[model samples]
Target: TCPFYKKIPGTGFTVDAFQYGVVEGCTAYFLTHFHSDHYAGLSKHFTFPVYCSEITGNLLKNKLHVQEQYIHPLPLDTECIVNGVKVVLLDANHCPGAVMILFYLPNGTVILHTGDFRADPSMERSLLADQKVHMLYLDTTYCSPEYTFPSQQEVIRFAINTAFEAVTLNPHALVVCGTYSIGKEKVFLAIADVLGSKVGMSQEKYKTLQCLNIPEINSLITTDMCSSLVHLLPMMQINFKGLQSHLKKCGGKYNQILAFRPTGWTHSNKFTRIADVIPQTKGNISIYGIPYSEHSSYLEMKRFVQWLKPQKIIPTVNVGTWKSRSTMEKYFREWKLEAGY
Candidate 1:
């Protein structure tokens, strides 16, 4: 069976990238998103064409500095012929410009590669109306059953409420949130919209949001940290080395900085000791890890599998972890065999 980022049996395209170099027989490259991990060994020196969504293509050229001629922008929900394969891009609902690729092989086998997505009803309706998917390359980032967190909307609401509550309780506090460069744009946007304040972010993140070109989000970006009531700092700056000085003066003129980390990893039993917000105080800064993910939780994955019922299920993550492969197989084998492919 073909693995993630590996070439299909008779195809000329590679799913993602090669670790140290380009794929040997790759005639084309399909990128699902602009995440760093997905484009491992790709660089500005790369010359081959990369097929991705419009925003991802812009990022490749603008951010990654990939050559313009090599970036092929694919439109959403439209099937096009690329390197002899019928390819269609579907909304992934993970992050801005993220897409799920559907490949129709010449042998009549339909493969659905969900690059990284949360469950969406509109996407499901469109997929179900078409041909039955023969194989599914699943996003198993939260495949374990312990992750039954609420929907993204609910989590965003929780985050907004918590942010306001923290600010109200600590009058002079600065609401600093740790976020990925691209994902979780909604959380800060919502916070800014409801609180009637601006969001300060790094230059790189500002560029990304500009590429997205959403008027509401573009108007909210500020480089001056003090210009806004809430600061959306990069995730790397949330640690001891970065926040040590700030934490020391929480109650002083610096005010209390209530930090937040929104991620899927916080969906664990240890982090979810409390239902909505899990707080861990490090020095003077109080940080809470919220359950906000762009991935399918275990229950969501089960429901997705039950709905699609692909002939075979191949996991995208934890392929080589100790017994992870077997665990994933055992987890989905029942549905795998029951599907009428």
Candidate 2:
């Protein structure tokens, strides 16, 4: 889905503000998470009043170099007023500091913007319990039934066990796992804390983890190249050709290398998704793609929509990629709940 910022009419408030470069103006901005795509337009010079979770605020200050004065840290589940709009931030369950925004408009309308999230049972007891959402700006990243995968816990177990199995087969080999800079931290931490090994990451990534202040991740991060046999590099950094070049630079000290990528695209039927491990071998390196993603699957999305039952549904995405509006309308129509309520 394409990133965007929506202005709440008459409220002077914007949700998920982007640095689109072509436009300028917003009374206040709410950041869903610290992902680069979400904040592509944000910079150290940004002057708008920004609201985000504490960890995200720290990231904006430490990593992104945004001034502290402009960043407001909003605690989860707490209600606050911004530009006369009643706003409450809820856990997005996507990544650290990712939040789902609930805005109670002055005209008695309640709009929800789920930045990027996976459905959680706890949501039923928290935000979904009220069921008063008038409009839902949904994250329709995996709104289709073709995208199905195990839960995060199950995927983490699979990844950790797979890494252990790979490294056990070749003790001298370097085990590398691909990850986003801030996302999929659970997979990295599990490999470190569960296996009792430090995961090597770039110095910048290590600093980002440090700002997250996760107790389990505190001692598990390392910048040293050889400090741990398992290395966690940005997903873009781990590839067959890159591994070959990296190993050559190691002067043959590492005889073998195993790479694992934990992502949602690993379990497609016709999409040719890779499973827990790629069966084919490419030279001296073996690559695996574990199904681990934070976005809600088709089932979860259905559950969320049925439970919330928003009057109007706006699927968050770039223009023209999908028939988001009609597709969502079809969901309610199929359920025979489109006429009223």
Candidate 3:
């Protein structure tokens, strides 16, 4: 029965009495992304009506397929009212369907929730440049000064290059890259691009990606119906080391295996522990350590915080861990930057 906001100890309770009760009296809910932290307890258990972009809505529907009725879908940049709260969905470039919700309360309090996002001016500049916002709810996933992320395109290119180089070196071996089902779909697309007409996708994902209608820049690189070419699907808590050994035992037939895993801070070392399970292989098994992070760096975080100069910044989705947030604040404080925990 103990509940309080501002992050408690082991108990994950951020209780605001206004959040519960009947549907008609529902308080406004804005989901920044499909990440677990953002939608930790938001299911049928919590009957409050929620609002989000179409992409986020689709993801929610897909992830928690059972609770589709509660979601109120809206397009990006459009304004809609939910439970008397003015909600505007903006682009959050961390993962697909991610959003930065702008909440215009009836009381005239404008709160901008920057969910788990990155410093991709290519995608989010238009959002940051928009109207002056108040009370920015930031995503300090990579708030520390030390962590710097490469561009999405650069990371994709690197991953592609790695796959190509690895494949070209050993034509007899098969390569399979691992990634978050939807989050790292772009990486798979990169592999497909390199594969060039030899791309194969799982039946379910192929259907989903087709429905998305993402225009591929390279028409030459198209997907073919060859399930045999690709194996090893994305998994949660799936043992990589065991799979590697298993693949190797299958006659070292596979040329490569790519893995796009969750970050340790947010996922609390869950994936890291599993990643360690895979016994270290020789140069034959190349594990790419390219940090394709979905959060902004310290410089980008300060820039966003500075641009939207909120009353009190709250890091919600990605910056859930105290150790992570503390590491971030330490860097900003040292740089004479204004950081609020």
Candidate 4:
């Protein structure tokens, strides 16, 4: 339903449109990452060549079992041509296989598609700040001023300390870290490292992490849950009801369950104050809904737009509704700084 993620203006390509129904005249398909929301329509029998980062390619093969002939891995910081257009990949600093794709048109048009990134200081200089980009397909997942989040490092530190404290307070408690198949590896991995415990996960999640090929992460993953103090779980499993059943499966090996959930969306006012971000306890279950967002916060979005100074800003998220699209367009009007000012 959104305009940007489905099709790039004036191109024979689509960015992460596996289920969008093959649009006519599409010669290239871009897969920015391995996330399901982006790769929903992708299947084994799908035709047309797909472009993505190397690690994502490994995942498409090893995990999704997609055919090799359709896969084309784009090298980082290297320029390549696909159907006569210049393309470059910047490390998205998101999930293991995520990337920020830049497309250069001979018409002097430059388009940067940040497929979902956590912004850092390095991007302003590295993305060729001097060059005028015409269109920016932004990942506006949290594109409102109300969505403020601390830095990823800060969140990681907070998770480490909180989990450590909880563990120390009750050495027999089980620590469960909420995670995705490819996102939030940094948090749980660091917790395992600091807690001096092996990480437990499902066989499927283990194989997916292994595709990243980082030594420490692979060695830390264990299938047998009993041997590990910390275990990786999906975000949905963080609730008391879910944790109760999960604890039941273990049969009294642990006294309590402490789950750390990191996400972009905030559910309640409990996340407002510093102390509010702390875990909420109910009986033997506790869960923390910290804003350890993988996407750029609203302030960072403005910072990125001020620096990039693109001629037009195209929001990829919140475009499903006309009201949201207009709200984002207002933000674009406010941030398209250079020529207007």
Model 4 backbone overlap count: 2
Tens-digit lDDT string for candidate 3 (193-218)? 67653445455655445434356633
TM-score of 4: 0.93
Runs in model 4 with CA error above 4 Å? 1-5, 267-271, 337-341
Pick the lDDT winner. 4
Candidate 2 Cα outliers beyond 4 Å, as residue runs:
1-5, 21-25, 251-253, 266-277, 321-325, 336-341
lDDT of 3 at 203: 54
Q: Lowest-scoring 10 consecutive residues by lDDT in candidate 3?
A: 7-16
Candidate 3 regions exceeding 4 Å error are 1-25, 42-47, 122-130, 197-232, 235-241, 245-280, 317-341
Ranking by TM-score: 4, 1, 2, 3
TM-score against native, each model: 0.90, 0.90, 0.71, 0.93
Best by TM-score: 4
Backbone collision count in every prediction? 0, 2, 4, 2
lDDT of each: 0.77, 0.76, 0.54, 0.82
Arrange candidates by lDDT, descending. 4, 1, 2, 3
Error of 1 at 207 (Å): 1.5
- Which pairs clash (backbone N, Cα, C closer than 3 Å) in model 2? 2-318, 19-41
Error of 3 at 301 (Å): 1.1
Candidate 3 is scored at a TM of 0.71
Query: How do the residues 1-341 of candidate 1 rate in per-residue lDDT, one tens digit apiece?
Result: 33544566578877766454656677887888888888776778898889999988888888888898888998888979998889899988898889988889999999888988887656668755667989888888877777777777877787788878877777777777787758878877887776678887677877777777466665677877656777777787776566666545334545577777776755264455334456778656777777777887787788778788787777888877868877888879765566543
